[PDB]
Coordinates of C-alpha atoms and ligand atoms in Angstrom, one line a residue:
Chain A
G1 CA -14.4 -136.4 -102.9
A2 CA -12.3 -136.4 -99.8
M3 CA -9.3 -137.8 -101.7
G4 CA -9.5 -134.9 -104.2
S5 CA -6.5 -133.1 -102.7
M6 CA -4.2 -136.1 -102.6
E7 CA -1.8 -136.9 -105.4
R8 CA -2.7 -139.8 -107.6
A9 CA 0.7 -141.5 -106.9
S10 CA 0.2 -141.0 -103.2
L11 CA -3.2 -142.6 -103.4
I12 CA -1.8 -145.7 -105.1
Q13 CA 1.1 -145.8 -102.6
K14 CA -1.4 -145.7 -99.7
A15 CA -3.6 -148.3 -101.3
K16 CA -0.6 -150.7 -101.3
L17 CA 0.1 -149.8 -97.7
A18 CA -3.6 -150.4 -96.8
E19 CA -3.4 -153.8 -98.6
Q20 CA -0.4 -154.8 -96.5
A21 CA -2.3 -153.7 -93.3
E22 CA -5.5 -155.5 -94.5
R23 CA -7.3 -152.2 -94.2
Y24 CA -9.5 -152.9 -97.1
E25 CA -12.0 -150.0 -96.5
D26 CA -9.1 -147.6 -96.6
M27 CA -7.7 -149.4 -99.7
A28 CA -11.0 -149.0 -101.5
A29 CA -11.3 -145.3 -100.6
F30 CA -7.7 -144.7 -101.9
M31 CA -8.4 -146.5 -105.1
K32 CA -11.8 -144.7 -105.6
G33 CA -9.8 -141.4 -105.2
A34 CA -7.3 -142.7 -107.8
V35 CA -10.0 -143.6 -110.3
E36 CA -11.6 -140.2 -109.8
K37 CA -8.4 -138.5 -111.0
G38 CA -9.8 -139.4 -114.5
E39 CA -6.8 -141.2 -115.9
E40 CA -6.8 -144.9 -117.0
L41 CA -5.5 -147.5 -114.6
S42 CA -2.5 -149.7 -115.3
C43 CA -2.7 -153.5 -114.8
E44 CA -1.3 -153.3 -111.3
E45 CA -3.8 -150.5 -110.4
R46 CA -6.7 -152.3 -111.8
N47 CA -5.8 -155.3 -109.6
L48 CA -5.6 -152.9 -106.5
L49 CA -9.1 -151.6 -107.3
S50 CA -10.5 -155.1 -107.5
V51 CA -8.7 -156.5 -104.4
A52 CA -9.9 -153.6 -102.4
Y53 CA -13.6 -153.8 -103.3
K54 CA -13.7 -157.6 -103.5
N55 CA -12.5 -157.7 -99.8
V56 CA -14.9 -155.0 -98.7
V57 CA -18.0 -156.6 -100.3
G58 CA -16.7 -160.0 -99.3
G59 CA -16.9 -159.0 -95.6
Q60 CA -20.4 -157.5 -96.2
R61 CA -21.6 -160.7 -97.9
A62 CA -20.3 -162.9 -95.2
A63 CA -22.1 -160.8 -92.5
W64 CA -25.3 -160.8 -94.6
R65 CA -25.1 -164.6 -94.8
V66 CA -24.8 -164.9 -91.1
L67 CA -27.7 -162.6 -90.4
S68 CA -29.9 -163.9 -93.2
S69 CA -29.7 -167.4 -91.8
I70 CA -30.6 -166.2 -88.3
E71 CA -33.5 -164.2 -89.8
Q72 CA -34.8 -167.3 -91.7
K73 CA -34.5 -169.3 -88.4
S74 CA -36.8 -166.9 -86.6
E75 CA -40.1 -167.5 -80.9
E76 CA -41.2 -164.0 -81.9
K77 CA -38.0 -162.1 -82.6
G78 CA -39.2 -158.5 -82.8
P79 CA -37.9 -156.4 -85.8
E80 CA -34.3 -156.3 -84.9
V81 CA -32.8 -159.2 -86.9
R82 CA -34.6 -157.9 -90.0
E83 CA -33.5 -154.4 -89.3
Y84 CA -29.8 -155.3 -88.8
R85 CA -29.8 -157.5 -91.8
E86 CA -31.3 -154.6 -93.8
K87 CA -28.6 -152.3 -92.5
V88 CA -25.9 -154.6 -93.8
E89 CA -27.8 -155.1 -97.0
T90 CA -28.1 -151.4 -97.6
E91 CA -24.4 -150.9 -96.9
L92 CA -23.5 -153.8 -99.3
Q93 CA -25.7 -152.2 -102.0
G94 CA -24.0 -148.9 -101.4
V95 CA -20.6 -150.4 -102.0
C96 CA -21.7 -152.2 -105.2
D97 CA -23.3 -149.0 -106.5
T98 CA -20.0 -147.2 -105.8
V99 CA -18.0 -149.7 -107.8
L100 CA -20.6 -149.8 -110.6
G101 CA -20.4 -146.0 -110.6
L102 CA -16.6 -146.0 -111.0
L103 CA -16.8 -148.5 -113.8
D104 CA -19.4 -146.4 -115.5
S105 CA -17.5 -143.1 -114.9
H106 CA -15.5 -143.7 -117.0
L107 CA -13.4 -146.8 -116.7
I108 CA -15.3 -149.0 -119.2
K109 CA -15.8 -146.2 -121.6
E110 CA -12.1 -145.6 -121.9
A111 CA -10.9 -149.2 -121.8
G112 CA -9.9 -150.3 -125.3
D113 CA -7.4 -153.0 -124.8
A114 CA -8.8 -156.5 -124.1
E115 CA -7.0 -156.9 -120.8
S116 CA -8.6 -153.8 -119.4
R117 CA -12.0 -154.0 -121.0
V118 CA -12.5 -157.6 -120.1
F119 CA -11.3 -156.9 -116.5
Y120 CA -13.8 -154.1 -116.0
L121 CA -16.7 -155.9 -117.6
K122 CA -16.0 -158.9 -115.3
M123 CA -16.1 -156.5 -112.3
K124 CA -19.4 -155.1 -113.6
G125 CA -20.8 -158.6 -113.8
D126 CA -19.5 -159.4 -110.3
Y127 CA -21.0 -156.4 -108.5
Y128 CA -24.4 -156.9 -110.3
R129 CA -24.1 -160.5 -109.1
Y130 CA -23.6 -159.4 -105.5
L131 CA -26.6 -157.1 -105.9
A132 CA -28.5 -160.0 -107.2
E133 CA -27.8 -162.2 -104.2
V134 CA -29.7 -159.8 -101.9
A135 CA -32.4 -158.8 -104.4
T136 CA -36.0 -160.0 -104.7
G137 CA -38.6 -160.3 -107.5
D138 CA -38.7 -158.0 -110.5
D139 CA -35.8 -155.9 -109.4
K140 CA -33.8 -159.1 -109.2
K141 CA -34.6 -160.0 -112.9
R142 CA -33.2 -156.7 -114.2
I143 CA -30.1 -156.9 -111.9
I144 CA -29.5 -160.5 -113.1
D145 CA -29.8 -159.4 -116.7
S146 CA -27.3 -156.6 -116.1
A147 CA -24.9 -159.1 -114.6
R148 CA -25.4 -161.5 -117.5
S149 CA -25.0 -158.8 -120.1
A150 CA -21.7 -157.6 -118.7
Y151 CA -20.2 -161.1 -118.3
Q152 CA -21.4 -162.0 -121.8
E153 CA -19.7 -159.0 -123.4
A154 CA -16.5 -159.8 -121.4
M155 CA -16.7 -163.4 -122.6
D156 CA -17.1 -162.4 -126.2
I157 CA -14.0 -160.2 -126.1
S158 CA -12.0 -162.6 -124.1
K159 CA -12.6 -165.4 -126.6
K160 CA -11.6 -163.2 -129.5
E161 CA -8.6 -161.5 -128.0
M162 CA -7.0 -163.7 -125.3
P163 CA -5.5 -167.2 -125.2
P164 CA -7.5 -169.8 -123.3
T165 CA -5.0 -169.7 -120.5
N166 CA -5.1 -165.9 -119.9
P167 CA -5.8 -165.5 -116.1
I168 CA -8.2 -162.7 -116.7
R169 CA -10.1 -164.8 -119.3
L170 CA -10.0 -167.8 -116.8
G171 CA -11.2 -165.8 -113.8
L172 CA -14.0 -164.3 -115.9
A173 CA -15.2 -167.8 -117.0
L174 CA -14.9 -169.0 -113.3
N175 CA -17.1 -166.1 -112.1
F176 CA -19.6 -166.4 -115.0
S177 CA -20.0 -170.1 -114.2
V178 CA -20.7 -169.2 -110.6
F179 CA -23.3 -166.7 -111.9
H180 CA -24.9 -169.5 -113.8
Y181 CA -25.0 -171.9 -110.9
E182 CA -25.9 -169.5 -108.0
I183 CA -27.8 -166.6 -109.6
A184 CA -29.3 -167.7 -112.9
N185 CA -30.7 -171.2 -111.9
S186 CA -28.6 -172.7 -114.7
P187 CA -26.4 -175.4 -113.2
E188 CA -25.9 -177.2 -116.5
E189 CA -24.6 -174.0 -118.1
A190 CA -22.3 -173.5 -115.1
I191 CA -20.9 -177.0 -115.4
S192 CA -20.6 -176.8 -119.2
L193 CA -18.8 -173.5 -119.0
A194 CA -16.4 -174.6 -116.3
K195 CA -15.6 -177.9 -118.1
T196 CA -15.0 -176.3 -121.5
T197 CA -12.9 -173.6 -119.9
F198 CA -10.8 -176.1 -118.1
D199 CA -10.2 -178.3 -121.1
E200 CA -9.3 -175.5 -123.5
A201 CA -6.9 -174.1 -120.9
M202 CA -5.3 -177.5 -120.4
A203 CA -4.6 -177.7 -124.1
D204 CA -2.8 -174.3 -124.1
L205 CA -0.6 -174.8 -121.0
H206 CA 2.3 -176.0 -123.2
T207 CA 2.8 -172.5 -124.5
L208 CA 3.4 -171.0 -121.1
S209 CA 6.5 -170.1 -119.0
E210 CA 6.9 -171.5 -115.5
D211 CA 5.4 -168.4 -113.9
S212 CA 2.5 -168.1 -116.3
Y213 CA 1.8 -171.8 -115.9
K214 CA 1.4 -171.3 -112.1
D215 CA -1.0 -168.4 -112.6
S216 CA -3.2 -170.3 -115.1
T217 CA -3.2 -173.6 -113.2
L218 CA -4.4 -171.9 -110.0
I219 CA -7.6 -170.8 -111.7
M220 CA -8.0 -174.1 -113.4
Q221 CA -7.8 -175.8 -110.0
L222 CA -10.7 -173.5 -108.8
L223 CA -12.7 -174.5 -111.9
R224 CA -12.1 -178.1 -111.1
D225 CA -12.9 -177.7 -107.4
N226 CA -16.2 -176.0 -108.4
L227 CA -17.0 -178.8 -110.8
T228 CA -16.3 -181.4 -108.1
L229 CA -18.7 -179.6 -105.8
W230 CA -21.4 -179.2 -108.4
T231 CA -21.3 -182.8 -109.8
Chain B
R1 CA -2.8 -172.1 -103.2
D2 CA -4.4 -174.5 -100.6
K3 CA -5.7 -171.5 -98.7
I4 CA -7.2 -169.9 -101.8
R5 CA -8.9 -173.2 -102.8
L6 CA -10.2 -173.7 -99.2
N7 CA -11.6 -170.1 -99.1
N8 CA -13.3 -170.6 -102.4
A9 CA -14.8 -174.0 -101.4
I10 CA -16.3 -172.5 -98.3
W11 CA -18.1 -169.7 -100.2
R12 CA -19.4 -172.0 -102.9
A13 CA -20.5 -174.7 -100.4
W14 CA -22.6 -172.1 -98.5
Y15 CA -24.8 -171.6 -101.5
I16 CA -25.4 -175.4 -101.9
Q17 CA -26.2 -175.8 -98.2
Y18 CA -28.5 -172.7 -98.2
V19 CA -30.1 -174.8 -101.0
Chain C
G1 CA -25.9 -140.0 -80.6
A2 CA -27.3 -141.9 -83.6
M3 CA -28.4 -144.8 -81.3
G4 CA -30.5 -142.4 -79.2
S5 CA -33.7 -143.5 -80.8
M6 CA -33.2 -147.3 -80.4
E7 CA -34.4 -149.3 -77.4
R8 CA -31.7 -150.4 -75.0
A9 CA -32.8 -154.1 -75.4
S10 CA -32.7 -153.7 -79.2
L11 CA -29.1 -152.4 -79.0
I12 CA -28.0 -155.3 -76.9
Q13 CA -29.7 -157.7 -79.2
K14 CA -28.0 -156.2 -82.2
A15 CA -24.6 -156.1 -80.5
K16 CA -25.0 -159.9 -80.1
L17 CA -25.9 -160.2 -83.8
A18 CA -23.0 -158.1 -84.8
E19 CA -20.7 -160.3 -82.7
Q20 CA -22.0 -163.4 -84.5
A21 CA -21.3 -161.6 -87.8
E22 CA -17.8 -160.4 -86.7
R23 CA -19.0 -156.9 -87.4
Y24 CA -17.1 -155.4 -84.4
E25 CA -17.4 -151.7 -85.4
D26 CA -21.2 -152.1 -85.4
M27 CA -21.0 -154.1 -82.2
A28 CA -19.1 -151.3 -80.5
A29 CA -21.5 -148.6 -81.8
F30 CA -24.5 -150.6 -80.5
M31 CA -22.8 -151.1 -77.1
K32 CA -21.9 -147.4 -76.9
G33 CA -25.6 -146.6 -77.6
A34 CA -26.5 -149.0 -74.7
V35 CA -24.0 -147.4 -72.3
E36 CA -25.4 -144.0 -73.2
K37 CA -28.9 -145.0 -72.0
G38 CA -27.4 -144.3 -68.6
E39 CA -28.2 -147.6 -66.8
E40 CA -25.6 -149.9 -65.3
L41 CA -24.5 -152.9 -67.4
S42 CA -25.0 -156.5 -66.4
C43 CA -22.1 -159.0 -66.5
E44 CA -23.0 -160.2 -70.0
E45 CA -23.4 -156.6 -71.2
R46 CA -20.0 -155.6 -69.8
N47 CA -18.5 -158.5 -71.7
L48 CA -20.2 -157.4 -74.9
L49 CA -18.7 -153.9 -74.4
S50 CA -15.2 -155.2 -73.9
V51 CA -15.4 -157.8 -76.8
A52 CA -16.5 -155.0 -79.2
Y53 CA -13.9 -152.4 -78.4
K54 CA -11.1 -154.9 -77.9
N55 CA -11.6 -156.3 -81.4
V56 CA -11.9 -152.8 -82.9
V57 CA -8.8 -151.5 -81.3
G58 CA -7.1 -154.9 -81.9
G59 CA -7.5 -154.3 -85.7
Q60 CA -6.2 -150.8 -85.4
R61 CA -3.2 -151.9 -83.4
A62 CA -2.4 -154.6 -85.8
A63 CA -2.5 -152.2 -88.8
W64 CA -0.4 -149.6 -86.9
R65 CA 2.2 -152.3 -86.2
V66 CA 2.4 -153.2 -89.9
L67 CA 2.7 -149.5 -90.9
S68 CA 5.1 -148.5 -88.1
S69 CA 7.5 -151.2 -89.2
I70 CA 7.4 -150.1 -92.8
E71 CA 7.9 -146.5 -91.6
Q72 CA 11.0 -147.4 -89.5
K73 CA 12.4 -149.4 -92.5
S74 CA 12.3 -146.2 -94.7
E75 CA 15.2 -144.8 -100.5
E76 CA 13.3 -141.6 -99.8
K77 CA 9.7 -142.5 -99.2
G78 CA 7.9 -139.2 -99.4
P79 CA 5.5 -138.3 -96.6
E80 CA 3.0 -141.0 -97.4
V81 CA 4.0 -143.9 -95.0
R82 CA 4.1 -141.4 -92.1
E83 CA 0.8 -139.8 -93.1
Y84 CA -1.0 -143.1 -93.3
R85 CA 0.5 -144.4 -90.1
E86 CA -0.7 -141.1 -88.5
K87 CA -4.2 -141.6 -89.9
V88 CA -4.4 -145.0 -88.3
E89 CA -2.9 -143.7 -85.1
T90 CA -5.4 -140.9 -84.9
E91 CA -8.3 -143.3 -85.5
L92 CA -6.9 -145.6 -82.8
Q93 CA -6.6 -142.7 -80.3
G94 CA -10.2 -141.8 -81.2
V95 CA -11.5 -145.2 -80.3
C96 CA -9.5 -145.3 -77.0
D97 CA -10.8 -141.9 -76.1
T98 CA -14.4 -143.0 -76.8
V99 CA -14.0 -146.1 -74.5
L100 CA -12.3 -144.0 -71.8
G101 CA -15.2 -141.5 -72.2
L102 CA -17.8 -144.2 -71.6
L103 CA -15.9 -145.5 -68.6
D104 CA -15.8 -142.0 -67.2
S105 CA -19.4 -141.2 -68.1
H106 CA -20.5 -142.9 -65.9
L107 CA -19.7 -146.6 -65.7
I108 CA -16.9 -146.4 -63.2
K109 CA -18.7 -143.9 -61.0
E110 CA -21.7 -146.1 -60.6
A111 CA -19.8 -149.5 -60.3
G112 CA -19.9 -150.6 -56.7
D113 CA -19.7 -154.4 -56.9
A114 CA -16.1 -155.7 -57.2
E115 CA -17.0 -157.7 -60.4
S116 CA -18.0 -154.5 -62.2
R117 CA -15.6 -152.0 -60.7
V118 CA -12.5 -154.2 -61.3
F119 CA -13.8 -154.9 -64.9
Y120 CA -14.1 -151.3 -65.8
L121 CA -10.8 -150.2 -64.1
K122 CA -9.0 -153.0 -66.0
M123 CA -10.6 -151.6 -69.2
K124 CA -9.4 -148.1 -68.3
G125 CA -5.9 -149.5 -67.8
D126 CA -6.1 -151.3 -71.1
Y127 CA -7.1 -148.4 -73.2
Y128 CA -4.5 -146.1 -71.6
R129 CA -2.0 -148.9 -72.4
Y130 CA -3.1 -148.8 -76.1
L131 CA -2.7 -145.0 -76.1
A132 CA 0.7 -145.5 -74.5
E133 CA 1.9 -147.9 -77.3
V134 CA 1.6 -145.0 -79.9
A135 CA 2.6 -142.1 -77.6
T136 CA 6.0 -140.3 -77.4
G137 CA 7.8 -138.4 -74.7
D138 CA 6.1 -136.5 -71.9
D139 CA 2.6 -137.2 -73.1
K140 CA 3.7 -140.9 -72.9
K141 CA 4.6 -140.5 -69.2
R142 CA 1.2 -139.2 -68.2
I143 CA -0.6 -141.8 -70.2
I144 CA 1.5 -144.6 -68.7
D145 CA 0.8 -143.3 -65.2
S146 CA -2.9 -143.2 -66.0
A147 CA -2.8 -146.8 -67.1
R148 CA -0.8 -147.8 -64.0
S149 CA -3.2 -146.0 -61.6
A150 CA -6.2 -147.7 -63.1
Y151 CA -4.7 -151.2 -63.1
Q152 CA -3.4 -150.6 -59.5
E153 CA -6.8 -149.6 -58.2
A154 CA -8.3 -152.6 -59.9
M155 CA -5.6 -154.9 -58.4
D156 CA -6.2 -153.6 -54.9
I157 CA -9.9 -154.3 -55.1
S158 CA -9.5 -157.7 -56.8
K159 CA -7.1 -158.8 -54.0
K160 CA -9.5 -157.7 -51.3
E161 CA -12.8 -158.9 -52.8
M162 CA -12.2 -161.8 -55.3
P163 CA -10.7 -165.3 -54.9
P164 CA -7.4 -165.8 -56.7
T165 CA -9.0 -167.9 -59.4
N166 CA -11.7 -165.3 -60.3
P167 CA -11.3 -164.9 -64.1
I168 CA -11.7 -161.1 -63.9
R169 CA -9.0 -161.0 -61.3
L170 CA -6.8 -163.3 -63.4
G171 CA -7.3 -161.3 -66.7
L172 CA -6.5 -158.1 -64.8
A173 CA -3.2 -159.6 -63.5
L174 CA -2.4 -160.9 -67.0
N175 CA -2.9 -157.5 -68.6
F176 CA -1.1 -155.5 -65.8
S177 CA 1.8 -157.9 -66.2
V178 CA 1.8 -157.1 -69.9
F179 CA 1.7 -153.4 -69.0
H180 CA 4.8 -153.9 -66.9
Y181 CA 6.7 -155.8 -69.6
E182 CA 5.7 -153.8 -72.7
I183 CA 4.9 -150.3 -71.4
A184 CA 6.6 -149.7 -68.1
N185 CA 10.1 -151.1 -68.9
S186 CA 9.6 -153.4 -65.8
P187 CA 10.2 -157.0 -67.0
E188 CA 11.0 -158.2 -63.5
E189 CA 7.7 -156.8 -62.2
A190 CA 5.9 -158.4 -65.1
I191 CA 7.4 -161.8 -64.4
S192 CA 6.9 -161.6 -60.6
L193 CA 3.3 -160.7 -61.0
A194 CA 2.6 -163.4 -63.6
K195 CA 4.3 -166.0 -61.4
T196 CA 2.6 -165.0 -58.1
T197 CA -0.8 -164.8 -59.9
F198 CA -0.3 -168.3 -61.4
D199 CA 0.8 -169.9 -58.1
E200 CA -2.0 -168.4 -56.0
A201 CA -4.5 -169.4 -58.6
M202 CA -3.2 -173.0 -58.7
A203 CA -3.7 -173.3 -55.0
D204 CA -7.4 -172.2 -55.3
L205 CA -8.4 -174.5 -58.2
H206 CA -9.6 -177.2 -55.7
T207 CA -12.5 -175.0 -54.8
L208 CA -13.9 -174.8 -58.3
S209 CA -16.5 -176.6 -60.3
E210 CA -15.6 -178.2 -63.7
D211 CA -16.8 -175.1 -65.6
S212 CA -15.2 -172.6 -63.3
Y213 CA -12.0 -174.6 -63.4
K214 CA -11.9 -174.5 -67.2
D215 CA -12.4 -170.7 -67.2
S216 CA -9.6 -170.1 -64.6
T217 CA -7.1 -172.5 -66.2
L218 CA -7.4 -170.8 -69.5
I219 CA -6.1 -167.5 -68.1
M220 CA -3.5 -169.4 -66.1
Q221 CA -2.2 -171.0 -69.3
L222 CA -1.9 -167.5 -70.8
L223 CA 0.1 -166.4 -67.8
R224 CA 2.4 -169.4 -68.2
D225 CA 2.8 -168.8 -71.9
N226 CA 3.8 -165.2 -71.3
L227 CA 6.3 -166.3 -68.6
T228 CA 7.8 -168.9 -71.0
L229 CA 8.2 -166.1 -73.6
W230 CA 9.7 -163.7 -71.1
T231 CA 12.1 -166.1 -69.4
Chain D
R1 CA -8.0 -172.8 -76.3
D2 CA -5.1 -173.5 -78.6
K3 CA -6.3 -170.7 -80.9
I4 CA -6.6 -168.2 -78.0
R5 CA -3.1 -169.2 -76.8
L6 CA -1.7 -168.9 -80.3
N7 CA -3.2 -165.5 -80.9
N8 CA -1.9 -164.2 -77.6
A9 CA 1.6 -165.5 -78.3
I10 CA 1.8 -163.7 -81.7
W11 CA 0.8 -160.4 -80.1
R12 CA 3.3 -160.8 -77.2
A13 CA 6.1 -162.0 -79.5
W14 CA 5.8 -159.0 -81.7
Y15 CA 6.9 -156.7 -78.9
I16 CA 9.9 -158.8 -78.2
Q17 CA 10.9 -158.9 -81.8
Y18 CA 10.3 -155.1 -82.3
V19 CA 12.8 -155.0 -79.3
Ligands
OQE1 O1 -12.7 -167.4 -103.0 C1 -13.7 -167.0 -103.6 C2 -15.0 -167.2 -103.0 O2 -16.0 -166.2 -103.3 C3 -15.7 -164.9 -103.0 C4 -15.2 -164.5 -101.8 C5 -15.0 -163.2 -101.5 C6 -15.3 -162.2 -102.4 C7 -15.9 -162.6 -103.7 C8 -16.1 -164.0 -104.0 P1 -16.8 -164.5 -105.6 O3 -16.8 -163.2 -106.5 O4 -18.2 -164.9 -105.2 O5 -16.0 -165.7 -106.1 N1 -13.6 -166.3 -104.8 C9 -12.4 -166.0 -105.4 C10 -11.8 -167.1 -106.2 C11 -10.6 -166.7 -107.0 C12 -9.3 -166.8 -106.3 C13 -8.1 -166.5 -107.0 C14 -8.2 -166.0 -108.3 C15 -9.4 -165.8 -108.9 C16 -10.6 -166.2 -108.3
OQE2 O1 -4.7 -162.4 -77.3 C1 -4.3 -161.4 -76.8 C2 -3.2 -160.6 -77.4 O2 -3.2 -159.2 -77.2 C3 -4.3 -158.5 -77.7 C4 -4.9 -158.8 -78.9 C5 -6.0 -158.0 -79.3 C6 -6.5 -157.1 -78.5 C7 -6.0 -156.8 -77.2 C8 -4.8 -157.5 -76.8 P1 -4.0 -157.2 -75.2 O3 -5.0 -156.3 -74.4 O4 -2.8 -156.5 -75.6 O5 -3.8 -158.5 -74.5 N1 -4.9 -160.9 -75.7 C9 -6.0 -161.4 -75.0 C10 -5.6 -162.5 -74.1 C11 -6.8 -163.1 -73.4 C12 -7.5 -164.2 -73.9 C13 -8.6 -164.7 -73.2 C14 -9.0 -164.2 -72.0 C15 -8.3 -163.1 -71.4 C16 -7.2 -162.6 -72.1
MG3 MG1 -1.2 -134.3 -109.6
MG4 MG1 -33.3 -154.1 -98.6
MG5 MG1 -20.9 -172.0 -125.0
MG6 MG1 -36.8 -147.6 -73.5
MG7 MG1 0.1 -138.9 -83.9
MG8 MG1 3.4 -157.5 -55.3

């Protein structure tokens, strides 16, 4: 890899600079370089990894959505709208595969604490979810089951090892509920999960400091917003 | 927080409107 | 070039799709491919070329500004902030050089109508201006004179061949006034140009249709906003 | 138009504040 010659600390430093500059492609390349040093990632570093790739794939998804809609709307268009949509799709799949590769080599393997293991399995579920959004048919089924399996393992650990207000646990539940609604054709599961997650978090807010309270209630608000949209 | 909530709502609403 | 196998019409079509998707890097690569077909560009195509590269270099400039400020603020930092700022700088210079290359091969050469020739010379001034923002010393002087020369030729043609409300003429004057203020250490020239441009455009608005009026007054408003900032 | 004017003002103001 092209980051092989750069110090791990320098890669992390530059990932933070790239974040400040909203240079998310660079940020992701720096964090990929950091992961490929072979050492575990700290909490802050895990967040940098996620922010980088979530923003990269977010841009790709947004573009894919613009093009997909144009495609579906097409007077004979020629092959160009399809071609360009496929170009973006392929690039998106490439980024997902890169992330999935990092998590499989060897972030998940070496993650023993709940905070890291749940985080990485949530990511695994997320990037399979993004692959699922652009997939068709039988390939879609396997991708969807890969997402489900990762989220489910993360859910099982989070329920055992983390309080109901833990932001990682909450963001996992949020995303798994989105998976149910948008990917798995399971709106009732989505709603049930979001509601139970919200209610169990509400009942644990009393334990929290001002700062932790703010972190937890943000994700709770997102659960509630989704519920309002879905009901 | 308002911005985060707004951005989330846009993404989620797209799916619903797509159908 | 990688776009060598794609039809010119398909490249233009995809540039418009990329614009809709805010995929400006793609848009620029498609338009570069189109220019390299060797034919002149229509008015709409010239605008696509400009929108693409202005947005690409705009992102690079914005990032450079974030990093430059961090750099100037630096407890011993190590070489990383400088290195990353230099990386962005080099990429920015690369994009400017690409644009300048397209204009020199052979857009300006073949541009005989005022609307095209002024447009391309304004672009030439702009991309030299962007190179000037990150330049130092003697290299800076030559770059600054290259910008000035291009803008000046464009100005001379625009005054001879276009009415004072022509949006291309107005945007050229706007940008040349910015060059004077920000690059050439000539704030009085900047102010004088913006004012004279505004006043001569005001006196020609009466000739315009509703639609042309809206186009012209937008750039006039930008001249006035700049004047307010500078005075 | 407001957005175009706002975006322009931000870019121009940066130079002034940079000095
Ligand atoms: O704002 C969105 C909308 O959706 C996306 C937009 C871009 C990229 C990815 C996704 P998503 O994975 O589909 O949710 N989501 C993030 C919600 C969130 C905010 C703060 C803390 C935790 C979660
Ligand atoms: O909004 C900006 C601020 O500045 C830039 C931001 C990004 C890229 C380039 C530049 P600039 O070349 O330095 O002006 N400028 C464009 C102003 C304009 C709007 C509409 C019509 C004509 C002109
Ligand atoms: Mg080392
Ligand atoms: Mg495909
Ligand atoms: Mg249950
Ligand atoms: Mg042909
Ligand atoms: Mg340099
Ligand atoms: Mg004069």
